[PDB]
Amino acid sequence: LPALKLALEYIVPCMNKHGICVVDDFLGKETGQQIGDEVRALHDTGKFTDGQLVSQKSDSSKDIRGDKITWIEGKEPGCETIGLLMSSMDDLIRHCNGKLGSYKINGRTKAMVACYPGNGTGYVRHVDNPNGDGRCVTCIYYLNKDWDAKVSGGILRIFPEGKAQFADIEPKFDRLLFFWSDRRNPHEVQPAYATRYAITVWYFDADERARAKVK
């Protein structure tokens, strides 16, 4: 679908309504598969960190590390398609100008590529931006082929604030996700038993960001 249509008939209304929006088959197999390869190349070439220190005790030969990350600008060699994904996310947001709440998005962060190694680690329940640092919208692109949460875990569980239930989103291949970055969406990544990749980009609201250093 053309971005503007995807944005106007789906993204905008879903976001203002639920604060969470899922888009399957965002770029298609050929482009989605290439992004997967570039991401996997960065991993195999050691561009990723060693992983978040989960269990830090006494004999550090058995320290347990979880999610590994690397910041991508999109212009790095061997990251062209990743750069293409970022431009595609930008166009959608751009088309949502002045319709996502009363926000006015003027910029974004670099892409944060994450790899949960599959050693049973996940990510504790958290709020992406709990202290008004400017990030209003979180955007995640998943690239995991035939991911079966029933055996591999790695579900993204979001607990919408004005709700008793929670939303379970599987890190499926070619899936694009949007959700308010603040207190409205506390979320967590359930333990992953298989290598799990995702690419995150946060969009900034001009006003929240502008006063971030003086509020």
């Binding site: 600008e73 003027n106 910029g107 974004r108 640092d133 400017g134 900034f204 250093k213």
Partner: peptide, 7 residues
Amino acid sequence: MDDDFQL
């Protein structure tokens, strides 16, 4: 803080 890119 986080680096900001103009889209």
